[PDB]
Amino acid sequence: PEMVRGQVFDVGPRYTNLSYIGEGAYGMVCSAYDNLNKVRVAIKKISPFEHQTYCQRTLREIKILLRFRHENIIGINDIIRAPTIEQMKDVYIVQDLMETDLYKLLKTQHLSNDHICYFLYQILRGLKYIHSANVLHRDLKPSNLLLNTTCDLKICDFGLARVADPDHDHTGFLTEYVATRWYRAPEIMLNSKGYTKSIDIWSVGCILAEMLSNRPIFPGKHYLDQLNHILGILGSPSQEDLNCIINLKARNYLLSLPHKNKVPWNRLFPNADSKALDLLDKMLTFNPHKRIEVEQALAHPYLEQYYDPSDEPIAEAPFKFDMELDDLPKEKLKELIFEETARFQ
Numbered sequence: 001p002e003m004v005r006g007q008v009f010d011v012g013p014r015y016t017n018l019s020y021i022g023e024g025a026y027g028m029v030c031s032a033y034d035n036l037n038k039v040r041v042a043i044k045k046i047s048p049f050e051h052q053t054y055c056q057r058t059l060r061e062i063k064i065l066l067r068f069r070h071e072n073i074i075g076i077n078d079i080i081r082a083p084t085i086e087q088m089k090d091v092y093i094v095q096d097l098m099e100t101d102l103y104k105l106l107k108t109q110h111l112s113n114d115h116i117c118y119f120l121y122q123i124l125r126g127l128k129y130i131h132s133a134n135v136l137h138r139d140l141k142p143s144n145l146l147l148n149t150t151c152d153l154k155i156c157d158f159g160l161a162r163v164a165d166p167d168h169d170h171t172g173f174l175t176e177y178v179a180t181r182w183y184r185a186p187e188i189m190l191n192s193k194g195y196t197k198s199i200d201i202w203s204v205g206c207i208l209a210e211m212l213s214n215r216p217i218f219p220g221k222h223y224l225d226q227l228n229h230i231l232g233i234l235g236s237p238s239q240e241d242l243n244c245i246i247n248l249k250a251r252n253y254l255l256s257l258p259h260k261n262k263v264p265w266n267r268l269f270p271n272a273d274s275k276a277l278d279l280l281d282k283m284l285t286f287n288p289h290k291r292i293e294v295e296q297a298l299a300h301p302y303l304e305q306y307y308d309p310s311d312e313p314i315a316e317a318p319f320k321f322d323m324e325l326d327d328l329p330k331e332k333l334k335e336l337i338f339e340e341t342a343r344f345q
């Protein structure tokens with residue numbers, strides 16, 4: 001029973017030579033050698049049966065990643081768990097080992113325009129597949145973008161993912177949100193539940209600004225401060241942008257603010273490619289209805305050396321509806337996780 005620094009990692013005999021990677025709200029990740037495929041892999045240990053929320057996230061991810069098959073999306077090679085529902089306390093997700101992530105890379109490395117261009121193309125190609133399956137990632141950020149030595153990119157962590165539900169997206173002002181603050185679209189704080197595809201596009205726009213300068217574009221220190229950073233760059237929303245905001249608390253908050261001028265992209269990023277800044281502007285549009293869609297972003301002149309619609313595949317079977325796991329307790333979801341992972345036994 002290998003132990004990765006004070007913790008049980010029961011993955012053998014197939015997985016040996018274990019070394020710690022990271023840890024978080026997704027469980028704990030480690031590297032290990034696979035004696036069957038003769039290569040090193042990544043193993044994610046999840047213990048979700050204590051909390052119902054963790055049961056949802058585990059099932060969500062397993063279900064999505066098992067259906068998805070795409071070069072720019074991390075696959076699941078194996079799932080390790082106990083032979084019975086009674087003995088099952090943990091779930092181990094085995095994935096292809098990646099060398100690093102874009103969060104770690106941006107902390108120490110300046111990217112050339114060619115690297116920015118290629119990484120962005122890959123994000124969008126993976127995102128086109130995700131959205132074609134009617135799925136929203138909802139937590140796109142540099143630590144969820146994995147890379148290898150040849151600059152291949154894979155989107156990981158679908159724990160917070162949901163099936164798109166545009167008809168049920170409206171909500172009140174300052175309504176609680178789970179996804180990472182710096183990459184949150186402005187509508188999240190105003191009137192949106194984050195149930196539309198446009199929320200992922202905003203996150204990609206933030207990632208692009210981050211690749212251009214090695215600094216987050218909207219580094220809010222807390223929740224309402226996020227919207228101050230966004231408005232501090234985009235300027236005051238137009239009358240037309242405000243007409244889409246019909247709940248009065250959000251509307252009157254925006255109207256109460258002093259007039260702010262848009263900070264031009266060329267001043268924020270004076271070394272950036274003019275086409276990169278034109279695409280950035282379209283992804284970081286205040287109005288989510290006017291915001292560029294994934295297929296238009298792929299067709300933008302900035303990505304013309306890579307744009308090939310016949311080599312940008314879509315999902316064969318989209319997810320019809322969102323799984324009603326909001327009220328299902330940790331026991332019915334334990335049986336669904338057990339059934340979903342049966343194939344790997």
Ligand SMILES: O=C1NCCn2cc(-c3ccnc(NC4CCOCC4)n3)cc21
Nearest residue numbers: 026042095096097098099100101156157
């Ligand atoms: O689902 C996940 N939640 C968030 C964290 N996370 C990482 C992975 C993962 C998968 C395959 N390889 C690697 N390699 C690492 C990348 C970082 O730098 C060291 C090597 N990481 C999957 C997840």
